[PDB]
Every structure is written in structure tokens, then in C-alpha cells.
Amino acid sequence: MENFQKVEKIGEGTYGVVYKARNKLTGEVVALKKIPSTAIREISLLKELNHPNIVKLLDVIHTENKLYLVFEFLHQDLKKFMDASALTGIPLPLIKSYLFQLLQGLAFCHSHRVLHRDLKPQNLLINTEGAIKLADFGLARVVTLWYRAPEILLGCKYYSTAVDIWSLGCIFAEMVTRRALFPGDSEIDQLFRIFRTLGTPDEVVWPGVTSMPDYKPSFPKWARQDFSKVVPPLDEDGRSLLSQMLHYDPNKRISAKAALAHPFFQDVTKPVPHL
Numbered sequence: 327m328e329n330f331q332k333v334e335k336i337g338e339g340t341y342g343v344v345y346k347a348r349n350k351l352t353g354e355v356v357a358l359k360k361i362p363s364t365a366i367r368e369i370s371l372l373k374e375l376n377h378p379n380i381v382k383l384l385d386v387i388h389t390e391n392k393l394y395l396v397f398e399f400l401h402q403d404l405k406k407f408m409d410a411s412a413l414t415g416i417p418l419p420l421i422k423s424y425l426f427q428l429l430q431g432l433a434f435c436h437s438h439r440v441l442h443r444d445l446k447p448q449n450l451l452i453n454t455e456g457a458i459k460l461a462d463f464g465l466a467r468v469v470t471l472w473y474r475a476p477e478i479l480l481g482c483k484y485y486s487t488a489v490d491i492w493s494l495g496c497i498f499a500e501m502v503t504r505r506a507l508f509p510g511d512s513e514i515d516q517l518f519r520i521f522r523t524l525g526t527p528d529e530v531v532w533p534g535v536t537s538m539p540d541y542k543p544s545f546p547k548w549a550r551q552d553f554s555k556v557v558p559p560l561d562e563d564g565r566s567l568l569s570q571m572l573h574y575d576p577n578k579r580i581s582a583k584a585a586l587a588h589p590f591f592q593d594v595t596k597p598v599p600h601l
């Protein structure tokens with residue numbers, strides 16, 4: 327760590343604090359994250375999980391029982407860009423570009439059996455060229471519950487890649503409407519917000535749901551809402567895609583690879599954002 331000079335704190339993340347830092351032996355500006363043999367080996371697998379839409383893990387430094395991760399630095403996160411764009415809205419072509427790029431990133435991770443597990447606007451980083459990148463991919467193997475898939479909330483311990491599709495669908499809806507889709511402030515508030523919008527799940531729409539660990543037969547039974555009410559003014563292609571990303575049954579939920587082939591992306595482009 328004597329090779330790095332901290333510049334500024336850029337995040338109080340889930341796995342540790344992140345700093346903007348300067349590498350004295352190359353002049354490189356990086357994101358330095360200050361965090362057992364199992365962890366060293368899993369984190370070393372992530373050094374090879376390289377893709378243009380995944381924030382690059384430059385180095386892993388284990389010293390004095392402390393673990394530091396050296397990452398590529400990007401100047402803004404999607405949380406800030408959404409806040410800066412709240413009065414006007416992110417233009418649809420840019421929403422579409424960001425969603426497309428994030429699906430490419432997830433399709434890549436998922437093809438290597440790597441899950442993110444905690445997608446949220448705070449760990450989606452953007453640059454001036456129009457790129458968006460996923461940060462903290464693989465580290466999971468007040469914390470926000472807003473983007474949590476219902477199977478996690480219902481106690482599934484062996485959840486799948488579908489959890490990341492759910493989170494990304496929540497983020498897509500939030501870019502379009504300029505408001506979080508399900509801003510729960512407890513696990514039950516989170517689950518009940520999901521149920522009030524998408525209907526209380528049952529054995530018809532989600533076979534096996536009633537036998538999940540935290541499922542309660544006493545859950546209130548809410549009727550489902552139309553997506554035309556939930557994400558106006560998103561067009562029919564976008565609503566169709568979103569509905570497939572928010573299917574209750576993780577097995578029915580669209581995969582990242584199938585989402586990339588959805589007609590919503592027929593006219594996708596790569597606009598440059600106003601930062």
C-alpha cells in the first residue's frame with residue numbers, strides 16, 4: 327500500500343470503503359477498496375473475469391491481515407446520474423443503451439456461473455464515452471433491499487442468475503419513471519411492495535412458492551397491476567421486456583442472453599451522456 331496515495335472517499339460500500347487513489351509506480355488513478363484462504367482464491371478468479379461492461383479488477387493485495395482490491399476508476403455512478411437527470415429524465419435511447427450494456431455484462435458473468443447478487447445504481451459506473459459498467463461482480467460469493475429478488479426475500483438459499491435480472495429490471499423501471507420501483511425499508515415491506523404491484527404470488531404463477539422457507543399462508547392477497555400503470559410512458563416493447571425480467575418464478579424470468587435478442591433493442595444506439 328505504500329505505492330498508493332488516497333485522494334478522496336468515493337463510497338462506503340457493502341464489502342468495504344472505496345477511495346479514489348493514485349498509484350505512484352505508473353501514475354495510474356484507481357479505485358482502492360479496503361476489505362481467509364477461500365476469499366483469496368475466489369477473488370483471484372475475478373481478476374480473469376474481464377469484460378468491457380465489468381469494472382476492471384487490476385490487483386488483489388493481501389497485507390497485514392487486510393485485503394485491498396485495486397480497481398479501475400470511473401467518475402460517476404448511475405445513482406448520481408439519475409439524481410442529476412430527475413427533472414428532465416434520462417433520454418430513452420440512453421436508458422436503452424445502458425440496459426443493453428448491463429445485459430451484455432450480466433450475460434458474460436452468468437456464462438461463467440458468476441452472479442452479482444447485489445445490483446443497484448450505486449454499483450453501476452458510467453463514463454463520458456457512453457459506457458456503463460458493473461462493479462463488485464463476484465464479491466458476494468443500511469444495505470438497500472430495493473432491488474432484491476423475491477426468492478431471496480422468501481428464503482431461497484440456492485438462488486440463481488435470475489436474481490440479477492430481477493435487480494436490473496427494477497433499475498430499468500427506475501430509469502424510466504425517475505422513482506424507485508420497490509423502495510422497501512424492511513424485508514416484509516419490500517416483499518409487500520412487490521406483491522402490491524405484481525400481485526401476491528401463488529402456486530399458479532410460481533409453482534413451489536408456498537413451500538419456500540419464509541412464505542406465509544397469511545400473506546395478504548393483492549391483485550396484480552398492469553405495467554401500463556407501473557412504468558408509463560414506456561412503450562410496448564419495453565413493458566414486455568420488463569415484465570419478463572420481473573416474472574416471479576426465477577425459471578420463467580428471461581435470461582440476459584435472451585433479453586439481448588428482445589425487440590426493444592432493435593434500434594439500440596450508444597449515445598454520449600451529459601455529465
Ligand SMILES: CC(=O)NS(=O)(=O)c1ccc(N/C=C2\C(=O)Nc3ccc4ncsc4c32)cc1
Nearest residue numbers: 336337339357397398399400401402403406461
Ligand atoms: C463520489 C460520490 O458520492 N458519487 S459519484 O461522483 O457519482 C461517484 C464517483 C466515482 C465513483 N466510483 C466508484 C468506483 C470506481 O470508480 N471503481 C469501483 C470499483 C468497485 C466499487 N465498489 C463500489 S463503488 C466502486 C467503484 C462512484 C461514485
